[PDB]
Every structure is written in C-alpha cells, then in structure tokens.
Design a protein around this ligand. Structure first.
Ligand SMILES: CCc1cnc(C(=O)NCc2ccc(F)cc2)s1
Length: 149
C-alpha cells in the first residue's frame, strides 16, 4: 500500500490531541494524514496533509526523529508528534468536502482498543468512532512517558 504521513498534534498541557472527522468510509475520527505523492519526502507529505485537513502548518515544528509509525495490513502510517500547539488555534480545512469537523480530545479518555461483544457471545469488535485513531493511542501514551514523564 502507498505509505501515509501526518501528525499527532498535542496542546500545551500534553492532555489533548487533535483529531479530524471525515465522511463516508472516513466518517469517524482519526489523526490528520494522507497518501505520499511521487518523489515527495515524508516530512513534506505530513505537512501537506495536515495543512489540507486542518489549515495548520506544522512545517516549522516537525522533529525528524519524533513520530509513531505503524504497519497495518501491509500499509505504513507515520505520524509526526507535534506538541505544544495552543488549544485556541483556529483550525479550518481546505474544503468541507473532505473534513466534517476538527476537535481536541482528551488523551486519557480515548480508547486504546475497541470493545469485544463477549456479553452477546458473538465474535469480533463493536463499532467505535475512534477506530482509525485507536492503534496509535497506547504507543503515543508510551512515547509521551518516555520523552516527558
Ligand atoms: C472505515 C474506517 C474508517 C473510519 N474513519 C476513517 C478515517 O480515516 N477517519 C479519519 C480521517 C483521515 C483523513 C481524512 F482526510 C479524513 C478523515 S477510516
């Protein structure tokens, strides 16, 4: 799959993270990210996708070694970690045709797994609007503990 790049933006308290909500297949909440273009560097793709989805330019804040990368179904997603962005920042996507809404969420309240259906003796996982964000949550919490503590 084509690699994706984007950001985990945190506020100044390190409490909250910025998520975006798309439409249709992308209808839940997730970190801002998207597919790398031909010959485009990872940092440039992250900034481009993040500015397209949120209107905030991370270019001056990216740190090369500060990211979480996950491979999910043989597609690689790398989110650069961007702390210290004020919660009163005005975020506005490029077009509302791709992004419904943009919100801060408390890290400690976000799930780091979906719930099973063991109450119903049924296999699988219950729907969860944070599905796309969930895989990054435990790694982010561990990364923040190691880097700030
Ligand atoms: C089917 C499972 C999914 C549910 N939500 C998905 C998703 O990607 N939401 C985040 C997002 C990322 C980039 C955007 F441009 C717009 C929204 S995918």
């Amino acid at each position: 799959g084509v690699p994706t790049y984007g950001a985990i933006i945190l506020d100044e308290t390190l409490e909250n993270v910025l998520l975006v909500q798309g439409y249709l297949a992308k209808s839940g909440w997730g970190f801002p990210k998207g597919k790398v273009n031909k010959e485009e560097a990872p940092h440039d793709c992250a900034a481009r996708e993040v500015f397209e989805e949120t209107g905030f330019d991370i270019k001056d804040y990216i740190c090369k070694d500060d990211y979480i990368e996950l491979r999910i179904n043989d597609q690689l997603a790398r989110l650069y970690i961007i702390p210290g962005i004020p919660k009163d920042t005005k975020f506005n996507p490029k077009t509302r045709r791709e992004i419904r809404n943009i919100e801060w969420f408390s890290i400690e309240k976000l799930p780091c797994h979906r719930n099973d259906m063991t109450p119903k003796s049924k296999l699988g996982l219950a729907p969860n609007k944070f599905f796309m964000a969930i895989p990054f949550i435990r790694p982010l919490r561990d990364w923040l503990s190691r880097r700030f503590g």
